[PDB]
Design a protein around this ligand. Structure first.
Ligand code: HEM
Ligand code: HEM
Ligand SMILES: OC(Cn1cncn1)(Cn1cncn1)c1ccc(F)cc1F
Ligand SMILES: OC(Cn1cncn1)(Cn1cncn1)c1ccc(F)cc1F
Lengths: 463, 463
């Protein structure tokens, strides 16, 4: 069961000794982030471990990281680890490979430009207002407030409107079908029984595909596929992502088909829905446990936007401390945790040989808390991202959205989305720890970056 | 079960309608060659069928064939269909892929040059003499002679000597270990229960690999691996392929390792052993059923080599009619039957779109018997390959060894090998049909190009 478990001993590369068949997976008992920090401390700048029989080489040298994510991206490090069983969701850009990915990224890039994002800001702003009305009703009843729920509704509202023109107050229609289905598109727990097993028996992935078993719930995807097929034909008569993609089908590429279009629509929901609500919850925890930060930010918002003035695209990008608070929260909680690329050819990068087929992994969470780059890394200190101090911040250490050609395509949208929500809420409310607030917050031990206990806070109206 | 069975209907490409899950495999009941001839006649110049869910596109236009095998070989059509479970035999050049194959073909090409072949001719000639002595003893007892056995011993003798310096009279030591093991390296029956099942459930191949199940008998390969490891270290103190490969390990490539070297040694045995004896048996059938051909050839040998003179490299290549007889036999019996390349990128070749992942198949057997290139294709007529008529012979229709960069690397060796045997035997014997000779010879219905009944003939001494 150790066909390939001698690879890192041969390369003279250090690392935790793997068990037969399991490789190192038993060390995931404390989750991805703990394993990566320990390996970093124990073994230093480079190490290896085995996901079953798959060798994973962790790298932490920023130059080596830039080779992987930027320099040799197209040549050597184009793809991520095979992810399935996926079915027709194989055509989603985040899952595609090589030339198919290159085409899809090209066909989809114009959809995410700052110009398009600016055009979508009025829609996103509408649902900040929906958020405040629903936040107030819970602020008007002295009842603690679980963040993930209120931001969940908000993220849902943004998604349905910006991707399909569906305009729903999802917290108050939690049971409309379109909410009912998209609500199921959550982050995957890559350490749950299923996804672990796929690591111990990946030779079982093609078997699942042949049985039409898919990691994306088949009902939800079918619901959306016909819904998209319905909208596409209704709009044909008489801003949203769907319309942008429909427009792109009217031109040097082949063009995206109808099924390629549905796969993007689904993957954007999946990428944005629970991620956005998770970060917003982490941000609010940091504000409630750091009231001066919350006060200073509330004063900054009030300066750019007096009389609780509605935020716009340009005023959002005017707010520095807002940017610093968002970025410092993404440093402590980089919710993807790791970046990965498959090494597709025998190569050598900055004087290290990398055998074809190794997964090169960048442990983002662990680097965000490295003392060798971040003083007092455990503390929420937004000053690190001040305009004076950002020059010493290495874009290859801080990678909440990845880097290079395969970085998060939704990065700009997601930052603007979250900033719009924080502005509107903070113009209206302050956020206070309850007795039931977990302090300090503790991270879950599974394959998701989330708190052990849900974040619950007091929400008082600024009247 | 028809995820991909609509591909050829979408491309407007004709072909036999596939069953769910099986694709078209049930049409292999009469073997590869019959299926290909029928499809050719029925559907014309291009058609499709499904090996389970794998789409296979047959092409017959010589220009399109040259694009596949020569023009876009490195760019698009580099690999054959995945073949496994193979274990460490994955490093054999005939199984390797992409850059690994390119390297191995480069590292091995100098081993097959005309210069090396000429140096090996004296060894091969020695076993022609062993052949004649063993043929005579069966010619001296008026007993019919099964060809595959006598040529089998000969092909075995050539292999052990040219690849390892092992010099054995294998017909008379049929039970020495080195014969015992290599005797098991026969052609695969790609239509037998196992290899069919791998076509209906190829998702089961990775499963077999994880269980260390291999299509090459594990005992034989282990026997040879240590035998090679033993010889490598004995020769180190105090012509063969092994020595040529050992020498290559002493130099712009990485160099072939010890295990890469063993994999070549094994694959060359496997490629040469039963193929050479099969063709030699087909040739002798054609001579016995065409005595004038046999007479004319025997007179040609006697002219170049008077007094039963031993053949040499240069006199072999002097014999035209010998060449014509060998080539006409390889036209009627091209024992690989088909050539294949995986289309690795969405491409278009001579105005036909080919989707990535399709297997492009060239049906060699069917083209060797096409009336649109070969008059009276069923008859053994060596005149087609006369120096006058060879100018109308299209190197992309006649492909007994394939074409392009991925053609049979052993072609020159195998022709010389067989020619040396035919010369020595025909200098000494004539070959006559017995009552028990199957006439006309009928091909087996399995996944091997072989006669239904074994070829048995009378062998009289020319004294
Ligand atoms: C705060 C929310 C989000 C975070 C932290 C985040 C983070 C990331 C990260 C770390 C990656 C991997 C980057 C790499 O491999 O270098 C990624 C990829 C990606 N993200 Fe996000 N993301 C977020 C929201 C979104 C949104 C709203 C979208 C909407 C379209 C989106 C679409 C994608 C896609 C399509 C990819 C794959 C890109 C490719 O393979 O070419 N993400 N994201
Ligand atoms: C009469 C005997 C033989 C015949 C008819 C034959 C025929 C063929 C054919 C049709 C192919 C496929 C070519 C293509 O895909 O274009 C091939 C490949 C090959 N043959 Fe043979 N062959 C014979 C004997 C040998 C021998 C004696 C060797 C000894 C080394 C050998 C080694 C190979 C190898 C290594 C390949 C794969 C080449 C590559 O993938 O680069 N064969 N042969
Ligand atoms: O898995 C992703 C990151 N990723 C994208 N391709 C490969 N990995 C999906 N995703 C992309 N944008 C948003 N989500 C992820 C999973 C969990 C998470 F918290 C963030 C995160 F990026
Ligand atoms: O399968 C082969 C041809 N081939 C090589 N790579 C892929 N296919 C093996 N082989 C190569 N030289 C000799 N044998 C074959 C099988 C049967 C046969 F009769 C000929 C034949 F070439």
């Amino acid at each position: 069961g150790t066909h390939s478990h001698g690879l890192f001993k041969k390369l003279g590369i250090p690392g935790p000794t793997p068990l037969p068949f399991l490789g190192n997976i038993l060390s995931y008992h404390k989750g991805f982030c703990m394993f990566d920090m320990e390996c970093h401390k124990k073994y230093g700048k480079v190490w290896g471990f085995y996901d079953g029989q798959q060798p994973v080489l962790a790298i932490t040298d920023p130059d080596m990281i830039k080779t992987v994510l930027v320099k040799e991206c197209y040549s050597v490090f184009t793809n991520r680890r095979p992810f399935g069983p996926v079915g027709f969701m194989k055509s989603a850009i985040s899952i595609a490979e090589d030339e198919e990915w290159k085409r899809l990224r090209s066909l989809l890039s114009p959809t995410f430009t700052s110009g398009k994002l600016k055009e979508m800001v009025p829609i996103i702003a509408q649902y900040g207002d929906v958020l405040v009305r629903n936040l107030r009703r819970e602020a008007e009843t002295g009842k603690p407030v679980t963040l993930k729920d209120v931001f969940g509704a908000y993220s849902m509202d943004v998604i349905t409107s910006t991707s399909f023109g569906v305009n729903i107050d999802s917290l108050n229609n939690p049971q409309d079908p379109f909410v009912e289905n998209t609500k199921k598109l959550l982050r995957f727990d890559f350490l749950d029984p299923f996804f672990l097993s796929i690591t111990v028996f990946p030779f079982l992935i093609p078997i699942l595909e042949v049985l039409n078993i898919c990691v994306f719930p088949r009902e939800v995807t079918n619901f959306l596929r016909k819904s998209v097929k319905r909208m596409k034909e209704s709009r044909l008569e008489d801003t949203d992502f769907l319309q942008l993609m429909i427009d792109s089908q009217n031109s040097s590429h082949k063009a995206l088909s109808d099924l390629e279009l549905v796969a993007q629509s689904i993957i954007f929901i999946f990428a944005g829905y629970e991620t956005t609500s998770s970060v917003l919850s982490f941000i609010m925890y940091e504000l409630a446990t750091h009231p001066d930060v919350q006060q200073k930010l509330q004063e900054e918002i009030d300066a750019v936007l007096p009389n609780k003035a509605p935020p716009t695209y340009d005023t959002v990008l005017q707010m520095e401390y807002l940017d610093m608070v968002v970025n410092e929260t993404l440093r402590l909680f980089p919710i993807a945790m790791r970046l990965e690329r498959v090494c597709k050819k025998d190569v050598e990068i900055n004087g290290m040989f990398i055998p074809k087929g190794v997964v090169v992994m960048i442990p983002s969470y662990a680097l965000h808390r490295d003392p060798k780059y971040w003083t007092e890394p455990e503390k929420f200190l937004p000053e690190r991202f001040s305009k004076k101090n950002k020059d010493n911040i290495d874009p290859y250490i801080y990678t909440p959205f990845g880097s290079g050609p395969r970085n998060c395509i939704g990065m700009r949208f997601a930052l603007m989305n979250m900033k719009l929500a924080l502005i509107r809420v903070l113009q209206n409310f302050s956020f206070k720890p309850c007795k039931e607030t977990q302090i300090p917050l503790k991270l879950s031990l599974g394959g998701l970056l989330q708190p052990e206990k849900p974040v619950v806070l007091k929400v008082e109206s600024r009247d």
